[PDB]
Amino acid sequence: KSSAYSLQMGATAIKQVKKLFKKWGW
């Protein structure tokens, strides 16, 4: 939620992974 909203497939998505890590915490 900043700028640029490209669909992508094998790039930006990666960043999304981090958004899923927000919960991931040893």
Contact assessment for residue 11 and residue 17, using Cβ atoms and an 8 Å cutoff: no
Rounded CA-CA distance 12/4 in Å is: 10
Contacts of 12 (CB under 8 A, 6+ apart): 6
The torsion defined by the Cα of 23, 11, 5 and 2, in degrees rounded to 10, comes to 50
The structure tokens 């909203």 sit at: 5
Rounded CA-CA distance 13/5 in Å is: 11
- 8-state DSSP, 3: S
Sign, CA torsion 15/19/22/26:
negative
